């Protein structure tokens, strides 16, 4: 029962990697997770915010994610190594990452309940930041993040490792 | 010497191509879509491009050759560092880069790049050009922190509730430029 629940939110994410967020169904969902397409009056209501609760969950996990990255860290040279970490070690830009994450910010600017999954997902990343950096520099450093996570992963040459840590401390300040 | 290529065709079928692309969302996008959105006989779609891949490959290089013109097009004015990060502010904080259309043709190439080597290539030739046009003005590793930033900060700044303002970012870029 919240068994149940659980594997709708995941079949709906799987549901966005097979057929993209436009195509994402109640019927397609149901389908995946294995479950009666009744369940799924049950636990939601519309496409959109069951979208909404979906890649919601998606966003947290990633939030875990990057929050963990600093687990060491007491202050901001540290934090600037975790950053690096953060993308030398390509774990927040893996296929499946992307795949959600991209499609996510595909829809935005057509799914206003979607965009507010992004902005909520920026804030928690800055609030984990500003335990070090100044407002500004935080957003600074989650926006490099956000485009070095995925041209670490996507160069033909990427960065090595100590030119990542040495523009990371570049946007530190 | 089956196929013909013609022209006309082409250019109609790879519109059509991103026309399906922005319909149906890039996942759901087949030949018999394309062809129905383009006013072309299906049978005619796998004798310019042999499959689905393909054509996506054409379409969206034929997107992110527009992308770069309009990226070129901010350093019309740039002859020094400064300037340089100038035109990069001006990029970012333009909000003409990161457009609706221009995220929802992006975004979904990204999302499918992991699965499918001929987007990755795409994205690979993207990101080359870019570095090519800032490394006139910045060393290598400078130039791909630059165009990094600049895809992070585009997104960011059109979607944050409370983005940072036109003085911010450029001291960001001129702490990126070194």
Known sequence: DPQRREKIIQATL???????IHAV????????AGVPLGSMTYYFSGIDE??????????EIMSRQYQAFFSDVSDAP?????????????QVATPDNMELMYQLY????????????????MQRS?????????????????????GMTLHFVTDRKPLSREEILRMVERVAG
């Open 14 to 20: 799987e549901a966005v990697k097979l057929y993209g």
């Open 25 to 32: 169904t109640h019927r397609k969902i149901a389908t995946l």
């Open 50 to 59: 069951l979208l909404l609760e979906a890649f919601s969950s998606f966003t």
């Open 78 to 90: 540290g934090a600037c190594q975790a950053i690096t970490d953060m993308i030398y070690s390509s």
């Open 106 to 121: 595909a829809l935005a600017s057509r799914k206003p309940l979607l965009k507010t999954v992004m902005q909520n997902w």
């Open 126 to 146: 800055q609030q984990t930041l500003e335990q070090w950096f100044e407002p500004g520099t935080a957003r600074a450093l989650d926006a490099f993040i956000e």
